Amino acid sequence: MSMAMSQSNRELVVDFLSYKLSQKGYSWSQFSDVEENRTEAPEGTESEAVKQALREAGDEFELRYRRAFSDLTSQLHITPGTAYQSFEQVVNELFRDGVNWGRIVAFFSFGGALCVESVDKEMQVLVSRIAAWMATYLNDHLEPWIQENGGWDTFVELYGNNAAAESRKGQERLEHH
């Protein structure tokens, strides 16, 4: 459908969203509305490099930037019939001054918050729609856009270690006044 490594990028978005789903209290053995999921599971071999880089980079950015995380889910919790229109509103809002470091880094928080709000509303049937539509349009062109070498190669190179680089409060500072 798009790219040859689509399975790798689709697995990354689905891995963070699958980890957060269970982190709230979701068990695969809970049978939550006849839930099982079994068809070409993720983790083709290792995927531990990027998984650890996303968990460390996303834990630090979420723990240092939980301000907009709440406003994101508080503006678009979950609808009974999501669409591209809703996805365009969240993307156009984050794309106003944030790409990759803010669009993607915050996207993991948007997909995890929308998934937990649907499962609690019995709307888990839409979680596969929002997760596929978001993971598709993301890896489609949003992956090769900036995540190409400045994301996959940057995350594997730095090991997804971005704590002080995010806060931007540990540089030379002092520009005016």
Residue 20 to residue 160: CA distance in whole angstroms: 18
Reduce the DSSP state of residue 175 to 3 states and report it.
coil
Q: Name the structure determination technique.
A: NMR
Residue for token digits 């979950």? Answer: 78
Where in the sequence is the domain holding 115, given as residue range(s)?
1-177
Residues 6+ apart with CB under 8 A from 6: 139
Please choose, from the candidates 122, 118, 140, the residue with its C-alpha nearest in 3D space to the C-alpha of residue 130.
118
Type and span of the H or E element at 66: helix 66-75
CA distances from 106 to 91, 93, 110 (A): 10, 11, 6
